[PDB]
With several copies, the nearest count.
Chain A
Amino acid sequence: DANLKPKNIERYELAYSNPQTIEACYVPPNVDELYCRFSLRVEANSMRPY
């Protein structure tokens, strides 16, 4: 509590876990390489105010 009083919590009460639900992503076994792709367009559009 505001780095002042440490809270009343009994010793055993912090040995408990905190469960959570998460999403995650891993490369599956035996894949040799991963690919990533995207496209890019460029326009000469700074010459004049929209």
Chain B
Amino acid sequence: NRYFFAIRYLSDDVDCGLLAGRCISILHGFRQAHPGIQIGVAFPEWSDRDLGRSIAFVSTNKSLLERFRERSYFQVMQADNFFALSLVLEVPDTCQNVRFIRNQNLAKLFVGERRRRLARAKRRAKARGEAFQPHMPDETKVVGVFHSVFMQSASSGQSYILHIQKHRYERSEDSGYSSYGLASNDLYTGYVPDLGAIFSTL
């Protein structure tokens, strides 16, 4: 009921965080052309120390996934021997699922985010008419492990980082993927198979 294909990086000096960002950007552009589609992003070479030198895409519609594979960027990168591409094939029925949820809460670890939050809070108080009296939290927080992907803004002058965590799957409800094929903590449920198996194919 599921199809996938994978891409591996051939060069030993490849920067995974820079390069991975381009594949996501393409997925986004495709999503804009055909709004009613669902394609998920998986990292079959995910590790606790690094992101890994490979990426894979998973979906349910074979004919649509083929169209994605035909996108010119991928074809060029293969021709110049930067990428190794697989063919589209069926997902094995003997595996387990993971989420790949992204966490925007981690933004609050950096000064720039706190500044913006407070500036808005001050201005917001004028409607209430009360004096601006902010109240700060304590000194210690605990967070999980995450990796970064470098991203360019869409039709603007900015760039920023995506922060990716890996959660184990638990089954409930119905699904949907975000514009980046990523999962959200709430109200964006989906999953991908953790295809670290049969990777000897590339």
Chain A residues packing against B (C-beta within 8 Å)? 22, 24, 26, 28-29
Closest CB in chain A relative to B22 CB, distance in Å? 26
Is B134 a contact partner of A24 (Cβ separation < 8 A)? no
**Distance (Å) between the CB of B181 and the closest chain A CB?**
27
12 contacts between A and B (CB under 8 A): A22-B109, A22-B110, A24-B109, A24-B110, A24-B111, A24-B114, A26-B111, A26-B114, A26-B115, A28-B136, A29-B118, A29-B134
Q: How many B residues have CB within 8 A of the partner chain?
A: 8
Interface residues of B in 20-74 (CB under 8 A from A): none
Tell me, rounded to whole Å, the shortest Cβ–Cβ distance linking A32 to chain B: 14
* Set of chain B residues within 8 Å of A22, measured between Cβ atoms: 109-110
A sample of 9 more A-B contacts (CB under 8 A), given A22-B109, A26-B111, A26-B114, is A22-B110, A24-B109, A24-B110, A24-B111, A24-B114, A26-B115, A28-B136, A29-B118, A29-B134
User: Nearest-CB distance from B134 to chain A (Å)?
Assistant: 5
CB distance from B121 to the nearest CB of A (A): 9
